[PDB]
Amino acid sequence: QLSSVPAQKLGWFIQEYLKPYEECQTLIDEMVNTICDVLQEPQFPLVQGVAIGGSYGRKTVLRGNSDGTLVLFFSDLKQFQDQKRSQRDILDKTGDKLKFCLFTKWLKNNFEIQKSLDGFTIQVFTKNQRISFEVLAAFNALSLNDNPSPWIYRELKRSLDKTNASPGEFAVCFTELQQKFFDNRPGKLKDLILLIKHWHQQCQKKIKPSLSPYALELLTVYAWEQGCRKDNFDIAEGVRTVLELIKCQEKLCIYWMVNYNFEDETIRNILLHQLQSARPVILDPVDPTNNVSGDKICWQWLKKEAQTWLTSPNLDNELPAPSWNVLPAPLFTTPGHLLDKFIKEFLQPNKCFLEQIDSAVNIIRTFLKENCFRQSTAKIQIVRGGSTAKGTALKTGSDADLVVFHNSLKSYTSQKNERHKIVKEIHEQLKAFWREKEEELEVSFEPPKWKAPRVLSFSLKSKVLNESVSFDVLPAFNALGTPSPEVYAGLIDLYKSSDLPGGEFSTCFTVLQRNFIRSRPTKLKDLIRLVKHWYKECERKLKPKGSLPPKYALELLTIYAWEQGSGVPDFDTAEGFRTVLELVTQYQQLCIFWKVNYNFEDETVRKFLLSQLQKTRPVILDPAEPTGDVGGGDRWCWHLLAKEAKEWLSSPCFKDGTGNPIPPWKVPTMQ
Amino acid sequence: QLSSVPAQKLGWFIQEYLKPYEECQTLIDEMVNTICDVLQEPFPLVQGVAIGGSYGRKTVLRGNSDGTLVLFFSDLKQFQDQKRSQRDILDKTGDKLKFCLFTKWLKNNFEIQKSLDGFTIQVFTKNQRISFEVLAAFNALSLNNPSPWIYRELKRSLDKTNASPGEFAVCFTELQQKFFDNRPGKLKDLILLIKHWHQQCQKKIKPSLSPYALELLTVYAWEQGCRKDNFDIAEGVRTVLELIKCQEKLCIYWMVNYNFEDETIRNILLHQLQSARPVILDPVDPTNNVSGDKICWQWLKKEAQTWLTSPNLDNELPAPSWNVLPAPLFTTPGHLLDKFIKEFLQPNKCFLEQIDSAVNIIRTFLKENCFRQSTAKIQIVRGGSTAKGTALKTGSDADLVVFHNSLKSYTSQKNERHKIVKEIHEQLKAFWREKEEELEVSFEPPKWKAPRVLSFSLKSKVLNESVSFDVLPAFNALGTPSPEVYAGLIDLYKSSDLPGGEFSTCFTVLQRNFIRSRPTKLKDLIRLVKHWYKECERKLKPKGSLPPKYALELLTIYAWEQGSGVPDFDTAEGFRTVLELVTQYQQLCIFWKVNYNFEDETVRKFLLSQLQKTRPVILDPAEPTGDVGGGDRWCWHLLAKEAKEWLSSPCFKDGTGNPIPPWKVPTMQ
Numbered sequence A: 001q002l003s004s005v006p007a008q009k010l011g012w013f014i015q016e017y018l019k020p021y022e023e024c025q026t027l028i029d030e031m032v033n034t035i036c037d038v039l040q041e042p043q044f045p046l047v048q049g050v051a052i053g054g055s056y057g058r059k060t061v062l063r064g065n066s067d068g069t070l071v072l073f074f075s076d077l078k079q080f081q082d083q084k085r086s087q088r089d090i091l092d093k094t095g096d097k098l099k100f101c102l103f104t105k106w107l108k109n110n111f112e113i114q115k116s117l118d119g120f121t122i123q124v125f126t127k128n129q130r131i132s133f134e135v136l137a138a139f140n141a142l143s144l145n146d147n148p149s150p151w152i153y154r155e156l157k158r159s160l161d162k163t164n165a166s167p168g169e170f171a172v173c174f175t176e177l178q179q180k181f182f183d184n185r186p187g188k189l190k191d192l193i194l195l196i197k198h199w200h201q202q203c204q205k206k207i208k209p210s211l212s213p214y215a216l217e218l219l220t221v222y223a224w225e226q227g228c229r230k231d232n233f234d235i236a237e238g239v240r241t242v243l244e245l246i247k248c249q250e251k252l253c254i255y256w257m258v259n260y261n262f263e264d265e266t267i268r269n270i271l272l273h274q275l276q277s278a279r280p281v282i283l284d285p286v287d288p289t290n291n292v293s294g295d296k297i298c299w300q301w302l303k304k305e306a307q308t309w310l311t312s313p314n315l316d317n318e319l320p321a322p323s324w325n326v327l328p329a330p331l332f333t334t335p336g337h338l339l340d341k342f343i344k345e346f347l348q349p350n351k352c353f354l355e356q357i358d359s360a361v362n363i364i365r366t367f368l369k370e371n372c373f374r375q376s377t378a379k380i381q382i383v384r385g386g387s388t389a390k391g392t393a394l395k396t397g398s399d400a401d402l403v404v405f406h407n408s409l410k411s412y413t414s415q416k417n418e419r420h421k422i423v424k425e426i427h428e429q430l431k432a433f434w435r436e437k438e439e440e441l442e443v444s445f446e447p448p449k450w451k452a453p454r455v456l457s458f459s460l461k462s463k464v465l466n467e468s469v470s471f472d473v474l475p476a477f478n479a480l481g482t483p484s485p486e487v488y489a490g491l492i493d494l495y496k497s498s499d500l501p502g503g504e505f506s507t508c509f510t511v512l513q514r515n516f517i518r519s520r521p522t523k524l525k526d527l528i529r530l531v532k533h534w535y536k537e538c539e540r541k542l543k544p545k546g547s548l549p550p551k552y553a554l555e556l557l558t559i560y561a562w563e564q565g566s567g568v569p570d571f572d573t574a575e576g577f578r579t580v581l582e583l584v585t586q587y588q589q590l591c592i593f594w595k596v597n598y599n600f601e602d603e604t605v606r607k608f609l610l611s612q613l614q615k616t617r618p619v620i621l622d623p624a625e626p627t628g629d630v631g632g633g634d635r636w637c638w639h640l641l642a643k644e645a646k647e648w649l650s651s652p653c654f655k656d657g658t659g660n661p662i663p664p665w666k667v668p669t670m671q
Numbered sequence B: 001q002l003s004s005v006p007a008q009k010l011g012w013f014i015q016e017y018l019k020p021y022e023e024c025q026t027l028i029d030e031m032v033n034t035i036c037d038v039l040q041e042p043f044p045l046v047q048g049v050a051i052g053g054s055y056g057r058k059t060v061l062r063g064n065s066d067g068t069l070v071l072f073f074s075d076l077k078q079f080q081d082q083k084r085s086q087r088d089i090l091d092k093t094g095d096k097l098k099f100c101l102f103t104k105w106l107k108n109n110f111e112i113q114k115s116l117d118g119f120t121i122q123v124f125t126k127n128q129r130i131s132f133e134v135l136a137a138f139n140a141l142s143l144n145n146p147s148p149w150i151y152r153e154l155k156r157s158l159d160k161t162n163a164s165p166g167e168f169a170v171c172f173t174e175l176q177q178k179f180f181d182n183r184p185g186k187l188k189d190l191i192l193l194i195k196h197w198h199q200q201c202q203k204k205i206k207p208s209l210s211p212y213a214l215e216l217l218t219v220y221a222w223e224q225g226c227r228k229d230n231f232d233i234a235e236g237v238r239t240v241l242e243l244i245k246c247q248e249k250l251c252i253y254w255m256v257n258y259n260f261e262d263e264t265i266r267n268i269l270l271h272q273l274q275s276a277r278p279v280i281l282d283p284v285d286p287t288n289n290v291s292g293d294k295i296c297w298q299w300l301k302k303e304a305q306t307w308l309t310s311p312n313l314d315n316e317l318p319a320p321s322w323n324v325l326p327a328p329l330f331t332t333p334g335h336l337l338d339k340f341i342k343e344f345l346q347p348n349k350c351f352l353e354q355i356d357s358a359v360n361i362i363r364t365f366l367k368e369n370c371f372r373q374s375t376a377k378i379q380i381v382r383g384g385s386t387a388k389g390t391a392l393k394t395g396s397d398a399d400l401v402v403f404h405n406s407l408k409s410y411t412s413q414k415n416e417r418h419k420i421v422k423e424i425h426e427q428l429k430a431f432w433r434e435k436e437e438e439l440e441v442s443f444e445p446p447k448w449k450a451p452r453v454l455s456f457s458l459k460s461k462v463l464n465e466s467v468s469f470d471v472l473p474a475f476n477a478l479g480t481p482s483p484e485v486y487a488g489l490i491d492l493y494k495s496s497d498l499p500g501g502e503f504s505t506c507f508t509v510l511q512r513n514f515i516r517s518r519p520t521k522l523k524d525l526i527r528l529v530k531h532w533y534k535e536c537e538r539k540l541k542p543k544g545s546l547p548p549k550y551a552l553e554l555l556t557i558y559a560w561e562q563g564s565g566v567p568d569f570d571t572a573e574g575f576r577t578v579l580e581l582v583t584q585y586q587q588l589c590i591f592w593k594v595n596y597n598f599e600d601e602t603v604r605k606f607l608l609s610q611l612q613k614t615r616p617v618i619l620d621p622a623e624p625t626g627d628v629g630g631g632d633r634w635c636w637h638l639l640a641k642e643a644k645e646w647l648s649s650p651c652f653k654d655g656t657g658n659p660i661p662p663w664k665v666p667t668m669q
């Protein structure tokens, strides 16, 4: 069945065959609630409570016969070592003997309590849906507090070392957290998990090792959380993303920080021991010791089945196959001598695609420059800037500026009507271009989407890859017309009168920014890619907690780190990155500027430049523009990046193959 | 009519008499839309229109009502283009055209009317009549969003022409719409009621004041009071009338469109803030002080007194009203700080005596009734901001720390703590059943949820003041303490880097005894600094996690102990020194050897590791693990920027106008 269904209508296939009937759900969940109530009446004096685990506990049940557990927290279980007191199977057998005699209300028709080793099991069934609850007894480890505070995991590690160590055997104690991690998530994410489990069951059915579905449930949750936080995604992107992750099984290493952190040294040493292991490494959200991935041999079969389904003609039907961008292994886990491989494999965009968008953008520039003004004698001049014009774009979220210079604009400010006219006519000419030239480009073109107050934007997409670049169109005063100080006196006469944030006129000087980072060694552009990725990973979790300083400040720290540390075309990337995290740690003393375009030679430039150098302790003046002050002194949450850098200095990335630490370069902090 | 309506059912009275009919509104607004469309068809000089007045703000009363609409003629290009009268010629041509230009039904409901300095147009429908003043303006906003350069160009033009403060304010009418459109419906109903009352006062008395001043005052009353989009309208009325009665103090302003950042604007605001009060700066033009003739506020005071004291208000003895200050601390001169603290920040002494008498009854009843079966009784210790003498008039809090023998360690005791708090909840319910009339203060029944802290509040019978207590089971660590107790805490933290102080409540007695018994002058400075912090938190909390309030109480004590250990001092120098220390947040390292000391083998070993922490570090004098001034953890950077802004304040200028210097306090100790 499954492989014959096209990628479109998979949501229908899931609704038609996999998802449980709402009728059976609304009977069984009342059955289970009644069971949970009856086991908690004082009848059963020994229970503190119950918690529900397995596929039922996670709310991921399939239409068929299905997995579940429920855990009884007996009050004589008070320590982790009580998990080893196996004689509680006697207690479970008494619980069975009692429970089977209750059969309360109508439910006597639908229970079937059954004898089993190491305690009983209760099945619950209905016309279609059937649940097979494994019954277990455990210490409620969570009752040591009301949250997974670090002392709980410290007591866990101590208990593991005191008894005979058996990693993950006590994970059952945390079943309450396992519910909390899987509720309040989108319905489509559940439907995707059901589809992935159904495929796994088909693979288990035809192949004749074993792997628990919880590993692929975690993998699917990680795929969604990293790739597409939207609650209305396309399931056919989800499947392709998960199968791409499974194909990477020898790299795969996924973990969550939702219940535990690298803060406590006792947990940090556990995570650093586990994260540095045989990939596929799958740490569960609730127990730092419980590596969920099964026998390595089973992932070989899952690879072969992933290849087989992913290459089928029912997938792979789009010209580029759409999928989310997720890394099999976060940067933190990669050893220091593998950084140069990591950058080349995951961060660099494809060279042929950049050549294609360069060829396309010169066509865009040529078509616009001739057509936008025909009545007026003054033509627009379009200059290309941003992260694709210099060679430092990432494979994801690339950007570009098309700065548009024109004679309508007489000053940096007070010209909104002229800029609106320039944008409107560029929008009209881009529409005419899309009408006339659609098949002459070797890249796909999104039609411009625009509204009167917003910036123009359009995107160029590969025809054979997922990569894309987004351009935005920015009218600017042609200040430049290295520049002589009579141009900078124009900016200075705006700011000299008051304290203000800098740099809103940055786009006027885009050529000096591009020419500052371009022509530098490719090794340094790759280090700039690495630092921009590290910053992107910081923003992913610190943005809820503050406004981080702008990325260009760390691009400038990366260049200052190279120029001061070692001005050589080839170097160890791990020492460069370690030095950048050193400079970010030293944020308390940041005095950086470059006398490339502006110097103390002029009477007003010197007067202004000697002022900004005393504005605030952190100061990183844009080499294109003295008012730029992009390392803003007192406004931005530098502290958060300094705390995160101080955390990252523990990373595997900064340990050599011998295991000894990698030192920073000796860079001055004031310059 | 109005004065006979009780405070309850004012919402009914507003719905019954004041609010316009929706059946009428749904014609007039389409009439105005059609007029605005016709005026924007090239009428080739009209770049656009914006609607001002009571219609523009969406505050129209049922009857005849005020409005304007502004025409942005394309030849108007600088502020001084307001001054050339020829706009009346252009208006008279626009009149001549627009009187002939009519469409569909609308000829039955327009009435264009000749007027001096340009025409006017009326629009009327069943039970309604809008009158529009028609004006010409340079659309100053077209320059940028109200960016600093716009107000710099404004001030330059104002000085270049024959200066006329507020005369260019018509240019900003689009911002005046943007400030009023989004706000909650009941705030509109309150504004309608306040305007109807003002019209009744204008009717019987026989100066004048424009309603925009009282509309701004009502918006400020709501924005400073309850931010809630649902409220009792009679609290709104009572707090607005209380603000009007304070007319000689009143000074209200907004930072929504302009800031003290740009020196050209800062000098305007500092000039305006120090003016005849009631000072009412409008949200959109820093020069447009909206308050009318000073004489009119005398009449408004007398009418506020008359209505507020009526038997239809003032019916509930603890008459509820939102606590809003007539004048923000920033506006008060330095030599008036000692008066400001005493007038607005100190709670009433008799109320504190009453809650002290009541809480000793609570403690006695709980201590005897809770464990009757067990031999071990609970011990209840009172702590927090009311036990030391540093509570504010608003948002006071206190801890009832409960010590018991069930608790054998700082951690892993949740069931015992749940039992203790559950039975305290039961005994507080029994107390409320038995003793409700023996207290001289009102008691809220405890409101509780199984995982949450238990809490209850004591309220005055005769004032709005209140105190909130919460009940906190704690390990009886103390049982000055000898180091064998601190070795217990140290053996938890020594093994790892962690945030500190989660066990702070165990040492509450050492915290209270540190701030208590200090001079009352220093407790009033602590009140002032806690108010400054509360005002910083009011606007910076959306932007980051501010450092905890207890850190600034310790900076205030360190500032006094180092600056001048004398029972009386200038409060303005103390506050200036606290803002100095907050500016030098990079260097704190502030601690006190009052309880712990280096005279031990483990405490010294831990404390020399605590001293070797982030440069900004403040150690709770009660507890070496307290470390209440965290480093990167907190958003100190923001308070150090706000302090640098506050150093311009009138509070730090003497009566001669010279600046007040800080005390010479060391930053490392």
Ligand SMILES: [Zn+2]
Binding pocket: A545, A546, A637, B544, B545, B634, B635, B636
């Ligand atoms: Zn912050």
